[PDB]
């Protein structure tokens, strides 16, 4: 019953094409609700879910200033990271960030997050203590010694245990008709021969709200996760997710196979068969 | 609510 609020931001240098593009997005669990795009005309934090749309002018003004301040902070950090690695201005470079909190189901705050990545590699991350840093590089250790003296980890701990949980609970009630609902997967099966003696049985799962789900193929042996084909979970675009798994079966032996589907919206796991 | 990032690397 735990929940999460998360903000993912991506800053991308574009040498010769002006200041780096900066994108930031906000999630409550698996539902995006807000965004910022430096290339967009508004230069404003923008709603992306129906329930956030009624926040007053103070909220959109204040959230816009915090995310614009982050965009300027990550412009300089790209220039600083270019110096730490002694790299040329030629070529684009990426600086990602992830932060947020995992409040429980009214068990309140449980965990916070504050991470950075440069060119797809870990750079620095707040530990679960919210009091110590994990620098991945020799150059990230420079930032770790600097952030240690400034006690910025106390600032993030004050945010992750405070404003992060205060906003996450507030979003959970305003979106309670959406965020708190669970959609069980809708399940069905297909049967296409691929050769004369074989068949590809495909177990489908559609329309489930939380992205987390488990699709498992079983023969008589109750598990064969070595010949099973499984696709990445994907967004339908209407707020639900979809996933499917396939297994190769002998023709006339389809009954030996059984598909198991587990999801939060199901009172008990399903058993699918031909 | 958005975080309060201003510190530099």
């Amino acid at each position, epitope marked *: 019953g735990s929940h999460s609020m998360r903000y993912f931001s991506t800053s991308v240098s574009r040498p010769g094409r002006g200041e780096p593009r900066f994108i930031a997005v906000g999630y409550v669990d698996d539902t995006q609700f807000v965004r910022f795009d430096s290339d967009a005309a508004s230069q404003r934090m923008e709603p992306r879910a129906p329930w956030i749309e009624q926040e007053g002018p103070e909220y959109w003004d204040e959230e816009t*200033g915090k*995310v*614009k*301040a982050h965009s300027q902070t990550d412009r300089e950090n790209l220039r600083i990271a270019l110096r730490y690695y002694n790299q040329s201005e030629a070529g684009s470079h990426t600086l990602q960030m992830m932060f947020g909190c995992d409040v429980g189901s009214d068990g309140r705050f449980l965990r916070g997050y504050h991470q950075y990545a440069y060119d797809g590699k870990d750079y620095i991350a707040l530990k679960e203590d919210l009091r110590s840093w994990t620098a991945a590089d020799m150059a990230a250790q420079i930032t770790k010694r600097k952030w240690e003296a400034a006690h910025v980890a106390e*600032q993030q701990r004050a945010y992750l245990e405070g404003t992060c949980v205060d906003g996450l609970r507030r979003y959970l009630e305003n979106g309670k008709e959406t965020l708190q609902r669970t959609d069980p997967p809708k399940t069905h099966m297909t049967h296409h021969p691929i050769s004369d003696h074989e068949a590809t049985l495909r177990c489908w799962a559609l329309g489930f709200y939380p992205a987390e789900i488990t699709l498992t193929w079983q023969r008589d042996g109750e598990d064969q996760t070595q010949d099973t084909e499984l696709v990445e979970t994907r967004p339908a675009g209407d707020g639900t997710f979809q996933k499917w798994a396939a297994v190769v079966v002998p023709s006339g032996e389809e009954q030996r196979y059984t598909c198991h589907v587990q999801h939060e919206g199901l009172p008990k796991p399903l058993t699918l068969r031909w | 609510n958005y975080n*309060y990032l*201003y510190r530099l690397f």
Partner: T-cell receptor, first 111, second 112 residues
Framework: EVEQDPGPFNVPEGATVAFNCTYS??????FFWYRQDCRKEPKLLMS???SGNEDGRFTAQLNRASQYISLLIRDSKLSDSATYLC??????????????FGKGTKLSVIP | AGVTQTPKFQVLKTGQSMTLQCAQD?????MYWYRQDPGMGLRLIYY???????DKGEVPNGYNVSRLNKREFSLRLESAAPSQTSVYFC???????????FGPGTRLTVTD
């Protein structure tokens, strides 16, 4: 806004003197004590950390819940006579982070 | 490694023009101009988040600025009035939220 002790503090040498400061904006992010000798520039004294920051005779504590700041000076000297500014770092309504400087409290140690 | 500021004192007839000067060698990106009046704390006039950019503060009217380099940030009174009689300080900081090291400060008495 930032408010602190009206002052002036007139204490004899060797005294322990405590400063009090309160900040209204609950979103404030960094906190400092600044000192400014008469007819001269402000200078940073120490950062208030709310875990406790002490530097010899000077100690400072931050109460995030009360939103109040305190400076503690043990063994007052005449070299401590100054105006002590409360400095708070709060995001403005725009995308900039500014420091609001308090009016401060004049300390006047007399031997 | 500090902040320097000129002049240290100045009289100005009403309507006289003046440009205070400031510089920092600490490789900071942010620079600020404050005015300190009796009975009130520091009041931001203009600041500069980084090179090529300047923005306003609490008391910007009657003043203008110019961020020449990363090093320099000057503040000009293009028409001096008694209301501007105050003690002006320049200051510098790594970026927005960092502690601001201050300059020696300038004394202005814009009188006849």
């Amino acid at each position: 806004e930032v408010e602190q002790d009206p002052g002036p503090f007139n204490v004899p040498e060797g005294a322990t003197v405590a400063f009090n400061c309160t900040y209204s904006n609950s979103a404030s992010q960094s906190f400092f004590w600044y000192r400014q000798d008469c007819r001269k520039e402000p200078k940073l004294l120490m950062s208030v950390y709310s875990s406790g920051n002490e530097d010899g005779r000077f100690t400072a504590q931050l109460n995030r819940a009360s939103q109040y700041i305190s400076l503690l000076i043990r063994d007052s000297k005449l070299s401590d006579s100054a105006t002590y500014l409360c400095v708070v770092n709060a995001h403005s309504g725009a995308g900039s982070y500014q420091l609001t400087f308090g009016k401060g409290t004049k300390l006047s140690v007399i031997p | 490694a500090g902040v320097t500021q000129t002049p240290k004192f100045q009289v100005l007839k009403t309507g006289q023009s003046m440009t205070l000067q400031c510089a920092q060698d600490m490789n900071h990106n942010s620079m600020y101009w404050y005015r300190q009046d009796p009975g009130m704390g520091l009041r931001l006039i203009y600041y500069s988040a980084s090179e090529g950019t300047t923005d306003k503060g609490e008391v910007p009217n009657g003043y203008n600025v110019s961020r020449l380099n990363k090093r320099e940030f000057s503040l000009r009174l293009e028409s001096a009035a008694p209301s501007q009689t105050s003690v002006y300080f320049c200051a510098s900081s790594e970026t927005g939220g960092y502690e601001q090291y201050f300059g020696p400060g300038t004394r202005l008495t814009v009188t006849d």
